[PDB]
Write a protein that binds this ligand. Structure first.
Ligand SMILES: NCCCCC(=O)N[C@H]1Cc2ccccc2[C@H]1Cc1ccc2c(c1C(=O)O)OC[C@H](CCC(=O)O)O2
Ligand SMILES: NCCCCC(=O)N[C@H]1Cc2ccccc2[C@H]1Cc1ccc2c(c1C(=O)O)OC[C@H](CCC(=O)O)O2
Lengths: 150, 149
């Protein structure tokens, strides 16, 4: 569970926002890309795994699950690539709510940035720092630190 | 000390590699950019601060220290922007050694990637996972977790 991440792809302003969610904490990293390709997803996962101890990734769709480039990145970075089938049905809704929340924050900051990518990173910041009382950023660190002492 | 980061800019293949080092752990994040501008540096810091609790950044040079865009990003993200003057002189050498190490790793992986940016991220991965025995990734998490409690 400390190593489990979920991929999530959402759309805004004719562009694609690719999100990785650390399932146990709600912590996220995100990027804007022109379109969701295997190459973009692979590069995104490589970055993520160099930054956090990513053991398992629930991929966001079948094309990324199948993609030989995504598979090569997962092999390179030591990531187990799994499907993202919500056998647990509350998973869909949690992701849906996060996309709506992220888009709301993006709208609240949108005017402060000339480019969408900046607004997205501002939203990542606000999301990870928001105290719910611990923040997502605090929860991911504690979960992984606990796991290292083990 | 858990919140202190250092910016570092190095060059390879006619491009610029921008690095942020978490001083207490040796943990890094890095990106390739065409050139080091205030705008690039500002965006890089915004990303970094959304991901880790960045309290203080020792900027890598006077142009980024002065840059109004870098200052605006630091204000936005709640970062104290300081100079990066190595009043402690072993700081220069530690950064110098890391740049040489990173470039060595980049060379060892260079053939596995079509683009420099990929090789740089592979080097970030290898650097942060390397056991020296804890890894830099393990050290940053422990330092920050200790601080939260
Ligand atoms: N006429 C002067 C207006 C000054 C406006 C001004 O300083 N805003 C601050 C507010 C603010 C708040 C947080 C972070 C950055 C910023 C700055 C905005 C900014 C900076 C770098 C960027 C940006 C943009 C953007 O505006 O989105 O876009 C992506 C780009 C990608 C990397 C590259 O390509 O370099 O880096
Ligand atoms: N002819 C078939 C050859 C297939 C080669 C092949 O699968 N290599 C793996 C090995 C490997 C190992 C780790 C991570 C990725 C990869 C892949 C390489 C790769 C993927 C995405 C990229 C890449 C490159 C690159 O090669 O550097 O470059 C940056 C780009 C940036 C985001 C964008 O622009 O989309 O994303």
């Amino acid at each position: 569970s400390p190593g489990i991440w979920q991929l999530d792809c959402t759309h805004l302003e004719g562009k694609v926002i690719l999100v990785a969610v650390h399932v146990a904490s709600g912590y996220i990293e995100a990027e804007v890309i022109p379109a969701e390709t295997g190459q973009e997803t692979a590069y995104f996962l490589l970055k993520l795994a160099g930054r956090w101890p990513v053991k398992t990734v629930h991929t966001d769709n079948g094309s990324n699950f199948t993609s030989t480039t995504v598979k090569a990145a997962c092999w390179w970075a030591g990531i187990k690539q799994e499907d993202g089938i919500p056998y647990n049905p509350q998973s869909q809704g949690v992701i849906e709510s996060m996309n709506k929340e992220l888009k709301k924050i993006i709208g609240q900051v949108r005017d402060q940035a000339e480019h969408l990518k900046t607004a997205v990173q501002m939203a990542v910041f606000i999301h990870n720092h928001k105290r719910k009382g611990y923040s997502a950023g605090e929860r991911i660190v504690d979960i992984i630190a606990t796991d290292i002492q083990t």
